[PDB]
């Protein structure tokens, strides 16, 4: 069992913040990287960034650079992704995804979370 | 010296051995004079997750 138990849906006002958690289980949490990838319900799939529990080094796309901050928590074996301003363009389900490789950032992911929805209100 | 290593890696701490620990963490020279001492510490240095 390598399932990633991810938090439930959240509803946030426009412009406000939100943080989403993924609780890792089964596999060794320290080694394998954790990418963050978003899917708007209307279209496609877009990647944001990753944070590795082995080091804490974080990288992002240019689009989300500065606007979003990521962090780890090895005590409960979980990773947190914070979005500062829940803009209405960011209403999406947010998938956390484990990289398929041991200690390299190589960009392909095996196992994905069950789906944490996020909504921007009106 | 003092360190904590994985259980199958205790054979690596010996002169002339090769591996990840023996080549990247702690290398004993081939002319080593001394004793290597180890014991299991699963019940005293580990926690669930």
């Amino acid at each position: 069992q390598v399932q990633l138990v991810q938090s439930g849906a959240e509803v946030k006002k426009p412009g406000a913040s939100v943080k989403v958690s993924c609780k890792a289980s089964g596999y060794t949490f320290t080694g394998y990287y954790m990418h963050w990838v978003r899917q708007a319900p209307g279209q496609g799939l877009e990647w944001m960034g990753w944070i590795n529990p082995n080091s804490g080094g974080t990288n992002y796309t240019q689009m989300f650079q500065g606007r979003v901050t990521m962090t780890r928590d090895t005590s409960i074996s979980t990773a947190y992704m914070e979005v500062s301003r829940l803009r209405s363009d960011d209403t999406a389900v947010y998938y956390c995804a484990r990289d398929r490789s041991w200690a390299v950032v190589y960009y392909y992911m095996d196992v994905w979370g069950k789906g944490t929805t996020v909504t921007v209100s009106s | 010296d003092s360190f904590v290593i994985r259980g199958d890696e205790v054979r690596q701490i010996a002169p002339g051995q090769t591996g990840k620990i023996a080549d990247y963490n702690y290398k004993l020279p081939d002319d080593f004079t001394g004793c290597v001492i180890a014991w299991n510490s699963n019940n005293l240095d580990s926690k669930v997750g």
Binding site: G44, L45, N59 | -
Partner: protein, 108 residues
């Protein structure tokens, strides 16, 4: 991002393909050009990772190669289990992955 054709047809027991295009540091640029299969309402799972190889548990009926400055993931002998979106991917350089739009494998 990776420009991509929108759809592909088929029927159970046939052959079909889904392509992803781009060359400037795109899918034709590097070798880490993995694909994914996403059903609606559930998480996706990667069926073709780097260039041509398949993960453990993936059926061998899927195939993939760069075929130049592009990509192609095919399906042979499709069934009801193989209809989903299919997203290409790449490095695209300097720690900035980009995905494609996604073609929906539809069987008549």
């Amino acid at each position: 991002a990776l420009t991509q054709p929108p759809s592909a047809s088929g029927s159970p027991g046939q052959s079909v393909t889904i392509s992803c295009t781009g060359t400037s540091s795109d899918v034709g640029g590097y070798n880490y050009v993995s694909w994914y299969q996403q059903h609606p309402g559930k998480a996706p799972k990667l069926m073709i990772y780097e260039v041509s190889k398949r993960p453990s548990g993936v059926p061998d009926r899927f195939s993939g190669s760069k075929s130049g400055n592009t990509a192609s993931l095919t399906v042979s002998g499709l069934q009801a289990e193989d209809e989903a979106d299919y997203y290409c991917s790449s490095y695209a350089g300097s720690n900035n992955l980009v995905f494609g739009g996604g073609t929906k494998l539809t069987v008549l």
